[PDB]
Structures are given as C-alpha cells and as structure tokens.
Amino acid sequence: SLISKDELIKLAYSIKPREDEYKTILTNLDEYNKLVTINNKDKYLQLKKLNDSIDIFINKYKKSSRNRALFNLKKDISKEVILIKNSNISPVEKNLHFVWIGGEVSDTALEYINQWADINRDYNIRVWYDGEAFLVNTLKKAIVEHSTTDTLQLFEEDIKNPQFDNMKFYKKRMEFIYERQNRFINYYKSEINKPIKPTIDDIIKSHLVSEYNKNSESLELYRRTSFEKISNNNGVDIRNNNLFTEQELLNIYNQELLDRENLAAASDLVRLLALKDFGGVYLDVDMLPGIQPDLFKTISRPSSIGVDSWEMIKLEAIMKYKKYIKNYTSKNFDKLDQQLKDDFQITLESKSEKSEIFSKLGNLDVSDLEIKIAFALGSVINQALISKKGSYLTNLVIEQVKNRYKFLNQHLNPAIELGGNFSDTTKNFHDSLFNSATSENSMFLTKIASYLQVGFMPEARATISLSGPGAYSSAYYDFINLQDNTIEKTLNASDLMEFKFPESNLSQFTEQEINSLWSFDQASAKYQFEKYVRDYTQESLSEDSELDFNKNTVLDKNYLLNNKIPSNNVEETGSKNYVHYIIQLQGDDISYESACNLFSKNPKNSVIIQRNMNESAKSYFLSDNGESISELNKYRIPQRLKNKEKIKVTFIGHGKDEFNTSEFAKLSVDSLSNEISSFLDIMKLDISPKNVEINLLGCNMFSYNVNVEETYPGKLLLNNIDKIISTLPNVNKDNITIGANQYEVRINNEGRKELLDHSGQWLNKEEAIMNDLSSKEYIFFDSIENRPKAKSKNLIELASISDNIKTLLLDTNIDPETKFILNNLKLNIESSIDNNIYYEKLEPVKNIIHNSIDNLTNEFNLIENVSDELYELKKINNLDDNYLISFEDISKNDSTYTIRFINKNSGESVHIQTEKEIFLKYGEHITQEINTIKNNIIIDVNGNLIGNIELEHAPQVNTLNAAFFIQSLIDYSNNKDVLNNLRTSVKVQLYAQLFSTGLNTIYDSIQLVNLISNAINDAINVLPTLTEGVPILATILDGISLGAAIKELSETNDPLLKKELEAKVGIIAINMSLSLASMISTVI
Amino acid sequence: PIYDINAGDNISTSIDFSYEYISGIDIYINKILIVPNLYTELVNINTDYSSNKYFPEIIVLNTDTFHDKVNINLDSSSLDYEWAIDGSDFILSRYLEENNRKILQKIRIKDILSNTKSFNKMMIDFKDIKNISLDHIMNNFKSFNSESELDRDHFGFKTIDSKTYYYNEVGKLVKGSININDSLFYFDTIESNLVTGWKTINGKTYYFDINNGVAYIGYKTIDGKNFYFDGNGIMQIGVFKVPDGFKYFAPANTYNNNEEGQTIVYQNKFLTINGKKYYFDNNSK
Ligand SMILES: [Zn+2]
C-alpha cells in the first residue's frame, strides 16, 4: 500500500507551517490507509479523492519544497491501482455475446458461431439483433446503386478517358447520396410523428417501393425469412430486452443507424451496452476458439513463412482434414512442402474429439473494475471483450463515447439545419469545427472532420475515433491516472499489457477476418471504380492494352547524355553514399523512358541494365570525366563506386491489373526471387554494403500497410531475406527494406511536378502526384516480433507536401472541384502526421550519447524496483528503519535467499529469508562497483586516500561510470526511503571496504557500532578529481597523486603524521625552521 | 539546476546558460547537455557570439515534471532558424553571417516526438514571437535535412570524398595542430580537414608533408631548396650542422632574394649571429 501518515510528515518537511491543503492531504491519506472493505470500488474512489487533493495543492504552491515528496506520492498511487485491480479476481459470468444488425445473418457467421457453441456448452450463446431494422442494408444498397448509375451517366463522355481522376466520380456520387439521405430523413420525420406509430421496416418498405421501384411482396418475404432464421439461431431482440435506458444513447444509436446507415457504429454501441447489462464475453462473428498449445508443438516453422501466415496455415489444415466448416479455403496450405503436409495430416487424424483440437474457455478470472480487450499489431482492438456485470471501466468507456458524440453533434447539427447541399454543409461544418481547436483536441478534430463521408468516399476514418479503439485507450488512461474525459492521451505499452485478453483463448487470424481487415484505401477505390465502369458500358479497357512488350529499343547514349542529364531539375539532398542499380525488366516505351529519367536524376551514382535483352544486357554508366557513357559487362560497376556503403536497386515493369496484384512484369514472386539471386551471385564480387533497399516501380504496384504478409512486397521480402543475408555478410535483417511505387515524377523548368503517364507524355496531375507520394511505405523485417513491419513515414516530405498544397490553394486559377479535393488531401496528410506521432512509430537514433543516457535511465529503474521490494520485505518482517541491509551477506538455499540485517544501535545481526531473486542480482552488482573505486586507490595514510591516476580512455570511462552509479545511490532521496535506508547501507559498505576489510568479515557488535558512526559522520567522495574538493595544486608523480598529502605535510606540526607519510609513502621535508637551528647550535 | 533540498518557498525554476562562460575552452568541449529536474519551468539560453569562437551543440533532455508547459527562451531573432527531425529528436538550427564569419548554432530537443504528451509539452520563445509550439514551427518555418557523413561515429582517419578528418576516442573532429602516432599533424581550424603545405602560426613557420600530412623535422629538401626544421618542426635560421658540414640558413633576401630559412652561397666572409662569430671558406662550409 501507500506510505503511512507520519512517514510522509517526515518526508514532506518544509520550514513553513502546515497549510490547509497539506492538512487535507494528510487526512485523506490516513482515511485511505485504514479502509477495510472487500468492495474495490470504495478503495478506488478513496484513491481518486486523495489524488484530487494532491493535485490541488501541487497546483497552488508550485514553488514549495514539499512537492518533491508529494509528487512521488502521485506516482505511487498509480502503481497502487494495479494492486487493487489484481486482487479479488473471480470467474466471469457464463455468457457469450455476438451482434448482427441490419440484415439477414450469413451462413458463414453461423458456422463460426456453432464452433463456439459446441465446445463451450456451459456458456449461454446470444446473438443480438434489431427486430425492427431488417431492411436497412437494402435501403443503403439501393441508395448507392442509384447514385452510382446517375453519376456514371453524367460523366459518360469523360469516363472512357484514361486521364479520369476518380475522385471527381466519388465526390459527385457523395453529393447524390447526401441528397437522398436528406430525403429519407425528412420522410421518416414526417411519418414517425403520426398518432399511430409504424415501425422502421414499414417506413423503409413504403419508401423503397415508392421511390426505387422495389416489389413490396419481395421485401415482406425477405423480412420474414431473416426473422425466422435469426430466431431459430438463438436470436435475442434489442428492443425487447430494454437496452437503451438513457435517451442520449438511443439518440446516438438512431443517428448512426438511420441517418447514416452505419451498421458498424450501431454494433459498437450495442456491444458495449450488452456487456454493461449482462456481463460476459463479447466476440466478433469471425473469431474462432484457440487451438491447443501442444497439438503442433512438434512441427518447426520454415524460415520462409512469417508467424501470422503460420497461424492461418494451422487453421486451414485443421479445417481441411476435419471439415468442421464448409468452403474453408486451403490456398496457403497447398503451397507447403509435402513433408509438412504429411506431418499435419498425421498429427491430426490421431485426434478424434473436437475438444482435443480447440480449447475451452473455462473460468476467466477478472476483477470488478477491469475490462479486457484484444490486441492486434501492438494496439488495442474491440474484436473480443471480457467484462463483469456493471464493471467500472465499461461505464468509463460509455462516458467517453457519449462525450465524443456530443462534441461532434454540437458542431454538426447547426451546420445541417441550414438545409444546404453537401458542399455547403461540408464548409460550414469544417469552419464551426476548426474555430474551436486548442492544444488538447487538435488531433481529434482533425480526425473527425470526415464524418459525413464514412463508407462512401475513400479514406474516411471517423469511426475509429468516435466509438472505436480511441474511446478504449482514453478510458484506460482515465482509469489508471484517476481522471475523467481525457481526449488523445495514451498509456505506455507496459501498462496496456495489463488488460490483454488471454491470447490462448482466441485465434484471430481466420479467413473471414482477413477479408474484413482490408480498408477502403486508394487501391481498392481505383480497382472498384474500374469494375463499375466495365459493368456499366460492357466494354474492355486496360491502361496498357496496346503497348509493345517486344520493341526492345536499345539505349541511345546521346539521348541520355545531351537531353536527359542537363534538363533535370531534381537534385536529391542528404547522404550521397549509395549506388543505384536501374534494372529495366520490360521492353515497352514507358519502361525505357522511366529508366532513362530515373538515371537522369543522379547520373554519377546510377547504373543502367537493360535486362529485357536477356543475353545482351550490359551496364551503362557515366564515365569518370562526366562526358561519356562507358559500358561494362552485366551487373558490373566501375571502380569509383565500389566503396559505397548502401545499395539501392529498382526493378521497372508493369503490374497486372487486379486487386492485390500477384504478377509484376509477368513474373510471379518466385521468378523474381530467382532474378534477385542471379543478380546477387554476380554483384557480390564488387561491393559488400551494409543496407539493401529494393523498389518495385510500375503501374498497379501499391504499398499496403495492413495485411503485409499477403501483399507482393511482403512475400518478396520473406522469400529473399535469407539469400540476401547469406550472400552479403555485413547486412542485418533490419537493414533490408522493400518499397513499391506507381508513378514516375519529374520537375519541369517551371517548378511544377509532372508524371510520365502510360500514354507516352508527361501531364501535370497534382492531386495524383501528391497522393501517390504521400502514400508510399517501406516494409522491413522486425526481428523482435519476427514479422514484416511498415517503416515510419518521412515527416519532412509530408510537411513539404502540405506546404505545396497550401500554396496551390492560394492560387485562384484552380477550379472549385479541385479545391475540395485538395482540402481533403490536406486533411489526410495532417492525419498521417498525427498518426505517426500518436502511435509512437518514430524509432530512436541509437548513437553513443543516446546509449549513455539510456543506460543511465535503465540504472534508475533498478533502484526504484529494489526500493519497493525492500519496503515490502522490511514491512513484512516488522523490521524498523534502524536496520541496514548488508548486500554482501545474501545466501541462496535452492528456493530462498537469507539476508543479514544490521542494527545501527546495537550491532546485533538478524537473518531474514525471502523468495525475491532481485535482492541478490542487485546486491552483487553494487559489490562490483565498489570493486573498481577500490581498485585505483593506493594505501591511505592519515585516514585519507591517496589514489592513482590513469590517462587512458579505456579505464577512465569505467571508473567514471562506477563513481556516478554509486554516488547516485548515496544521494538518492526517494520516497519510501524512510522505512528502509539505502543511502546508509551503501555508505557503510563503502566506508567498510575502503577503510577496513569489509562488513562481511566484521561480527563484533562494538566494532559495528563504531564503524557505523564513523561512516555516517564521515563524508566520502568518489567521483574522479585531482584534489578532492577544493583547488590547490597537482603534483602527480608516476601514476600517483600527492597534492593533498604534500599540502598536509607542509603545515602539520605533528610527528605522528610525518612518520606515517614517511613510512607508507616516502616524503621527506627539509624543516627550514629557525628554532631548530638555534637548538642544534646550542646542543653542539 | 542547483538543488538545495530544504531551501523553502524559493526553489528556483530556471536554468540559465550563456555561450560566454565557456569562452576560451570551447575547443575542448564535445556537447552541452542541459538536464532539467521536476521544478524546471523555464530554460534561458542567451545566444550571442561576440566572445566565443566555436559554439557546441546543445541537447535539452526531457524529464518528468509537474509543469504543463516548459519554455525554452531564446534571445535571438526567429528569422534565422530552421528545423529538422532525427529519429525522435527535434533539431533547431540558426545560421548567421557576420564579419565574414559564419555562425552556426544547433539545439536538439531529445525524444520530444516520442508521444503526444512530450510533443505538446514544450513551448519556445523567440525575441519577436512568443509561445511558439513545435507544431506551429513545423507548419510555418523552413526546413532542412540533418544527415551527413561528418556526423557519424568514427575513431581514426576518415577520407570523406576529398579530405581527411580525424576523430577522437569520443567521436569528435580534431581542430588545430595535434600529435598522433608521434607525429605533428595540423587540421584546419574551421573545416577540420587535414592541412598540407607551408603554414605560418603566430610568426613561426612549419611545413606539413603532402604525402602523409606529417610535419617535417630535421634537414629537408623542398623543390631544390634546402631547409632546416628543429625538433618540433619550426623552421630555423642560423648556422647549422647538416650531413655535409656547417651551412648557413639565411634570412629573407640576404643573398639573391633567397627565401627565409634557405641555404645560401656564402664565400670567404665572416659571420656574426647574436654575438657568435663564424668564418666560411670557399665552399660555404
Ligand atoms: Zn502498365
């Protein structure tokens, strides 16, 4: 627990009288220390009251001397909360919740549900549904279909132009959808207000049949079949079970379900309220039970497959061999080797019971304050939740949702009420929004600005901030730091690890879950618009339908040398320490032009290889004088580039037009891996770099940041990392990165960017350039978690893009459509910056000073850990503050450690046993440090040290670290340093080993008391100087310091000190005194 | 900050640093390392340059404290500054040109980009603008790129593209003449690149070899003229012994416009040097 009242009174000492607030703090602290109740809620509320009082005082008297102690008290309170949480744990209620609203439940979901029902028969399955909203999704689909057709019709002349920027299509479509949504909302407002209330489904049916020409009988049949199905599959009605008791939550639910047709946010609210009212475990409709830990413990994962693909493969093998679920694919499983497949089948067919393969839940122990949430990619996600009935954190989360929705509505409703079209509502909403920005909600406001576009236009993500994981992270911060209603604050990962859903119970990498996981990015937007246009005109289109992949134009050296090189305006800044291979793979005109321009960007460090001419490929590079294009054999480089540190290689080609493309320049992953291996076995003859950065440039090559291992660059990295590291010995795994781009960009003489389009000429498409530049991601192999990770974005480039966008918006020659597009792009770039900072994605520098400071902090962690453990131990064994612990006398017995405590008053020694290994690990550590200070000390004389001097940088650094570490322990004034004493244990050990033979061999209590008094009264200095304390004079003889002894001997007038200095050192003064001269004259 | 534990209601919330208290010894310092504690609310950095000659990079460390905002108070004009990022550090750089002297000062705020709290906690005060956040700086100031081979960590000679540099055991460039492996090198005092050729320091002349950069000592031949350099490489004037006898190394324009310190033709005449007499025969020995 916390320190008690009087120890704080001693710690928080100040000369001034006790203010009123200090009295209040003492009162609340004592009231807490005596609170005996098993209801953790009262303990938590007492901690909250104490913390509030401490904050009041600290804010009122910022300059006071007591604050130090009080501040540490706050720290301790936070840790205290965890101790409250981790007690009185009890099994969660036997309930299992799923949610499906707005339509008929699919059969696949029902199979995933039955998998949970079968092995967990002691749990009550509930599938929540909305019995009066079975036709909502049909309404949404009808709106989208009609608006899509109208918009394709309106652009019918332009849509066949390949220069089409589909963002125009999407903005027009969104305007139509906003019109139709307002229409339905007004209809519903007019209908529901009747004396006789019709249900929502009847209103939707009337509106659909009236406006979009649906058959009423078909809608009625659909409603009936959906109802009977979900009723026969454990269905539970929302409205029959009285979930929405507060009018505000019901208003939020209606606003999400009806005004926006956002089924996801409705499901978020409903999941929270179900957990609050009933307790239990919430699960998505595509989570499967955890596989037994030991089932495949015998099969080793190949190096060529990541961890997530391994879990997916295991589930696929199970579902293939046992056939629990229908139509479960085996696409990943079939690519395995035959041995692994046979091991899978062997290990499986021996297992008969479903309970031998999937693990039961059993009793999950959770406290009445906590809610547990699943983890993905290191961040929280609401796929799976555990909560008791009436948990505290659940009400915290609901208050967060209500607060964020109230701040949204406060700005949105007045902007809607004007009755304007989509664009005017957008503008008024944005202005009312950004008029209220402060330092605390800038990121939040930037994120929720795209609320009107969620689900219709690409890259709208307000749901994450409104009811998604943002509310959960904020709730966890409010919980641990005893506040309320924080926005965009976060806990560190070490604290979030407390609330993790036990991973052994959940298999998150199912097949339906990966399909749910793909986001509505720019890639899916382009490839879905293409589908729309194909299906509307019944045509065939391709960007490169008619290009020649055989032209095989040979490199025109003069075209490169006299035109491409001098006309280039793009100089790269930064380190010029790389060599850039340019490997052109395909022979069309665009590949040739892009290769030539990419070479022109940096002629001195780049080499061209025209691989498409398979046997005749040669390396063309600018000669050393800069006037001519020399050539060498394939993949070979001139001498002037062999000393570079980094390689960058660029493959050029065209990617196949499909979502998540599988073929690049008509080569699969393995063909290109063979190409890389062939390149490496020749390249390794000339250069041994420390980094490798591969690019894939061409159409349809996107950079995805979710589902990395499923995409082309992820597969490429996983397949080639072993070859690259085995062939080039200096390269770490974390030094190999893979990127993909779509467009080739140049800068004209006018200062604007232009991209070489697939039709042969450079247009200046600013929106596409900005978007493609800002979207690029570099993927590398994280060796700690052992999986592909996207590397953090370059913030300087993003800031430059945003500045360019602002300057373009100043130029009034841009038409209003492009103004709206540019404004949305600016919002997305600001959101990307804020995401890079908020999710803690920026990696530290890691050089010498940063290593030093980090080691200092790591040392400062151990001290507080040991201090808490010592407080605990001394408090349990009822040892008071007079006992000093001796870190030299810890003895191990096979589970325990015996530590000797020394009384500072009587010298009597006590022995205490403990289970904590830390006391030993630290105790030896300090024992080594005092073994370096004492290793450059030369025999002391007058109770004073005469040390050695070393002037090499090898032994000077260790001595300085030893002195800083021990000095910090001896000057450490922590809280909880009063029941124990660490400033004195270390000081006494130091004094004993410096002026004696050590505490470990001294047992006589009188010697102990005298030595303790000597140590405590005497101050020792260990950090290296030449004249301990003051400045006097340095006389360093051969590696020996003698300034202090010499200055002592030239005034001492003490024969004993002179004798000691002569005997142990060798110093001999002259004694030029007149008195002695006179005495000797008289003697003779 | 100076910590007097029981001082009472006067605990100082300020760290005041000036580039003028390290004048003289600023060639012996690697970096300046400001370390705030719980109470630190203001960080005064008095810039200036009429006193110092080399200004070390400042590093402002980020600690836990109970203040909501920490001010860094710079006394200079906001017009000269640029920003960059390096990992999690935020770098401000000031460039001026005064009296043909380029003034370059760098301030690195360490790990301020690690999370939202640290990012929002620091505020900056220039002379003409006050309370400038880091986000505002990112949005309104020019930006530069912070990476170069001269900023890496080495421990011996480096040969960055035309020019040699030497790094101490702590990875800092060396400026001014210094002895390595029992030889006197001279690294230029601004660019820190190895200097070769003739060098006149405070009125005494040295010659640094073009092959290795080491200063010549002893009796040496340079372009058909014979010179003599003493034990430390300082060129000497007088009558000295060489492997072929005793020869005259004469002042400037003593005979046929001979350069200072070259041997000359001295036939059949007496010589007087600060009271000592010599006589040179027909062969100038
Ligand atoms: Zn193409």
Task: Give the minimum alpha-carbon distance from A573 to chain B in angstroms, rounded to a whole number.
Answer: 7
Contacts of residue B99, defined as CB under 8 A and 6 or more positions apart, other chains included, come to none
Contacts of residue A3, defined as CB under 8 A and 6 or more positions apart, other chains included, come to A11, A73, A76, A975, A976, A978, A979
Are B170 and A848 within 8 A, CB to CB? yes
How many CB atoms sit inside 10 A of residue A686's CB?
A: 14
Taking the centre of ligand 1 as the mean of its atom positions, its distance from the CA of residue A332, in whole angstroms, is 28
Residue A102 · residue A137 · CB < 8 Å: yes
Taking the centre of ligand 1 as the mean of its atom positions, its distance from the CA of residue A681, in whole angstroms, is 30
Distance of CA A607 to the CA centre of its chain: 38
Minimal CA–CA distance to A760: which of A543, A533, A566?
A543
Task: Give the minimum alpha-carbon distance from B67 to chain A in angstroms, rounded to a whole number.
Answer: 9
Taking the centre of ligand 1 as the mean of its atom positions, its distance from the CA of residue A758, in whole angstroms, is 7
Sequence length of chain B is 285
Residue A833 · residue A798 · CB < 8 Å: yes
Let me know the angle formed at the C-alpha of A634 by A631 and A640, rounded to the nearest 5 degrees.
55
Nearest CB partner across the interface for B11, out of A63, A488, A490: A63
Backbone angles phi, psi at A712, to 5 degrees: -60, -50
How many CB atoms sit inside 10 A of residue A244's CB?
A: 17
Cite the DSSP H helix spans in A279-371.
307-322, 338-349
Catalytic residue of the set A699, A911, A925, A953: A699
Residue A333 · residue A317 · CB < 8 Å: yes
Chain B: residue whose CA lies nearest to A57: B66
Residue A592 · residue A556 · CB < 8 Å: no
Check the annotation: does A146 bind a ligand: no
Q: Which residues of chain A are within 8 Å of residue B143 when distances are taken between CB atoms?
A: 796, 799-800
Q: Which residues of chain B are within 8 Å of residue A443 when distances are taken between CB atoms?
A: 116
Which of B31, B37, B115, B121 to mutate: most A Cβ within 10 Å? Answer: B115
- Ion ligand 1 contact residues with beta carbon within 5 A: A 544, 654, 699
Task: Give the minimum alpha-carbon distance from B100 to chain A in angstroms, rounded to a whole number.
Answer: 26
Per DSSP bridges, beta strands B58-60 and B101-109 are: parallel
* Token duo for residue A142: 């009808």
Task: Give the minimum alpha-carbon distance from B203 to chain A in angstroms, rounded to a whole number.
Answer: 32
Residue A607 · residue A679 · CB < 8 Å: no
Catalytic residue of the set A97, A580, A654, A925: A654
Contacts of range A906-911, beta carbons closer than 8 Å, 24 or more positions apart: A906/A1005, A906/A1009, A907/A1004, A907/A1005, A907/A1006, A907/A1007, A907/A1008, A907/A1009, A907/A1012, A908/A1005, A909/A1003, A910/A879, A910/A883
Which of A853, A864, A983 to mutate: most B Cβ within 10 Å? Answer: A853
Residue B256 · residue B262 · CB < 8 Å: no
Nearest CB partner across the interface for A799, out of B67, B113, B143: B143
How many CB atoms sit inside 10 A of residue B223's CB?
A: 4
Nearest CB partner across the interface for B38, out of A68, A443, A573: A68
Give CA–CA dist A216/A210, Å, rounded.
Answer: 10
Contacts of residue B217, defined as CB under 8 A and 6 or more positions apart, other chains included, come to B229, B230, B231, B232, B233
Residue A585 · residue A652 · CB < 8 Å: yes
Give CA–CA dist A1020/A815, Å, rounded.
Answer: 77
> Resolution for this model in angstroms, one decimal place?
3.2
Distance of CA B21 to the CA centre of its chain: 17
What per-residue string of b and e applies to A373-401 under the rule 16 or more CB within 10 Å gives b? bbbeeeebbbbbbbbbeebbbbebbbbbb
Give CA–CA dist A762/A768, Å, rounded.
Answer: 13
Contacts of residue A75, defined as CB under 8 A and 6 or more positions apart, other chains included, come to none
Task: Give the minimum alpha-carbon distance from A913 to chain B in angstroms, rounded to a whole number.
Answer: 36
Q: What is the DSSP letter of A256?
A: I
Q: Which residues of chain A are within 8 Å of residue B116 when distances are taken between CB atoms?
A: 443, 488-490, 837-838
Residue A765 · residue A165 · CB < 8 Å: yes
Minimal CA–CA distance to A496: which of A386, A373, A369?
A373
Give CA–CA dist A781/A732, Å, rounded.
Answer: 10
Check the annotation: does A758 bind a ligand: yes
Has A699 been annotated as catalytic? Answer: yes
Taking the centre of ligand 1 as the mean of its atom positions, its distance from the CA of residue A634, in whole angstroms, is 26
Distance of CA B63 to the CA centre of its chain: 31
Give CA–CA dist A92/B90, Å, rounded.
Answer: 47
DSSP H or E segment with residue A251: helix A247-254
Q: Which residues of chain B are within 8 Å of residue A973 when distances are taken between CB atoms?
A: 5
* Token duo for residue A706: 């979710």
Q: Which residues of chain B are within 8 Å of residue A13 when distances are taken between CB atoms?
A: 6
Reduced to 3 states (helix: H, G, I; strand: E, B; else coil), residue A877 is coil
Give CA–CA dist A695/A601, Å, rounded.
Answer: 16
Residue type for position A547: L
Are B67 and A62 within 8 A, CB to CB? yes
Give CA–CA dist B9/A113, Å, rounded.
Answer: 66
Check the annotation: does A699 bind a ligand: yes
Give CA–CA dist A879/A1005, Å, rounded.
Answer: 18
Reduced to 3 states (helix: H, G, I; strand: E, B; else coil), residue A88 is coil
DSSP H or E segment with residue B103: strand B101-109
CA atoms within 13 A on the CB side of B282: 0
Give CA–CA dist A169/A152, Å, rounded.
Answer: 8
Nearest CB partner across the interface for A795, out of B85, B114, B115: B85
Are A853 and B61 within 8 A, CB to CB? yes
Task: Give the minimum alpha-carbon distance from A445 to chain B in angstroms, rounded to a whole number.
Answer: 15
For this PDB entry, the determination method is cryo-EM
Are A796 and B85 within 8 A, CB to CB? yes
Q: How far is CA A285 from CA A34, A92, A279, A508, A591, in A?
A: 47, 20, 18, 11, 46
Are B11 and A71 within 8 A, CB to CB? no
* Token duo for residue A265: 């946010």
Q: How far is CA A936 from CA A939, A986, B202, in A?
A: 10, 19, 42
Q: Residue A942, class by beta-carbon neighbours within 10 Å (0-12 exposed, 13-18 middle, 19+ buried)?
A: middle
Per DSSP bridges, beta strands B42-46 and B70-74 are: parallel
Give CA–CA dist B8/A15, Å, rounded.
Answer: 6
Are A843 and B113 within 8 A, CB to CB? no
What is the phi-psi region of residue A867: left when phi exceeds 0, alpha when psi lies from -120 to 50, beta otherwise?
A: alpha
Backbone angles phi, psi at A711, to 5 degrees: -90, 170
Chain B: residue whose CA lies nearest to A843: B87
Residue A25 · residue A46 · CB < 8 Å: no
CA atoms within 13 A on the CB side of B70: 27
Give CA–CA dist A499/A373, Å, rounded.
Answer: 7
Distance of CA A138 to the CA centre of its chain: 38
Q: How far is CA A478 from CA A437, A487, A1006, in A?
A: 22, 9, 55
Q: How far is CA A1048 from CA A524, A531, A677, A1045, A1054, in A?
A: 85, 95, 76, 5, 10
Any idea of the CA torsion for B209, B213, B217, B221, to the nearest 10 degrees? -10
Backbone angles phi, psi at A660, to 5 degrees: 55, 60
Task: Give the minimum alpha-carbon distance from B6 to chain A in angstroms, rounded to a whole number.
Answer: 6
Contacts of residue B172, defined as CB under 8 A and 6 or more positions apart, other chains included, come to B30
Q: What does the H/E/C string look like for A606-644?
A: EEEEECCCHHHCCEEEECCCCCCEEEECCCCCCHHHCCC
Are B87 and A490 within 8 A, CB to CB? no
Give first-to-last CA distance, chain B, whole Å.
70
Any idea of the CA torsion for A1040, A1041, A1045, A1047, to the nearest 10 degrees? 140
Which of A64, A65, A73, A800 to mutate: most B Cβ within 10 Å? Answer: A65
Chain B: residue whose CA lies nearest to A577: B149
- The position carrying tokens 């004034």 is A973
Are B171 and A848 within 8 A, CB to CB? yes
**What ranges make up the beta strands (E) of A623-752?**
629-632, 646-652, 691-697, 736-741, 745-747
Are B88 and A844 within 8 A, CB to CB? yes
Give CA–CA dist A331/A410, Å, rounded.
Answer: 49
Helix axes A816-838, A795-810, angle to 10 degrees: 160
Distance of CA A237 to the CA centre of its chain: 38
Sign, Cα dihedral of A146, A150, A152, A156 = positive
Give CA–CA dist A577/B148, Å, rounded.
Answer: 9
Reduced to 3 states (helix: H, G, I; strand: E, B; else coil), residue B97 is strand
Give CA–CA dist A768/A727, Å, rounded.
Answer: 39
Per DSSP bridges, beta strands A235-237 and A124-129 are: parallel
Per DSSP bridges, beta strands B42-46 and B15-18 are: parallel
Distance of CA A187 to the CA centre of its chain: 46
Query: CA gyration radius for chain B?
Result: 28
Are B169 and A953 within 8 A, CB to CB? yes
Q: How far is CA A489 from CA A461, A485, A498, A1008, B41, in A?
A: 19, 10, 17, 53, 22
Minimal CA–CA distance to A139: which of A210, A213, A220, A208?
A208
Q: Which residues of chain A are within 8 Å of residue B169 when distances are taken between CB atoms?
A: 953
Residue A513 · residue A524 · CB < 8 Å: no
Q: Which residues of B touch A (CB under 8 A)?
A: 5-11, 13, 31, 33, 38-39, 41, 59, 61, 66-67, 84-89, 110-111, 113-117, 119-120, 133, 135, 138-139, 143, 145, 147-149, 153, 169-171
- The position carrying tokens 């079970």 is A241
Q: What is the DSSP letter of B17?
A: E
Give CA–CA dist A389/A91, Å, rounded.
Answer: 12
Give first-to-last CA distance, chain A, whole Å.
82
Give CA–CA dist B33/B109, Å, rounded.
Answer: 10
How many CB atoms sit inside 10 A of residue B5's CB?
A: 9
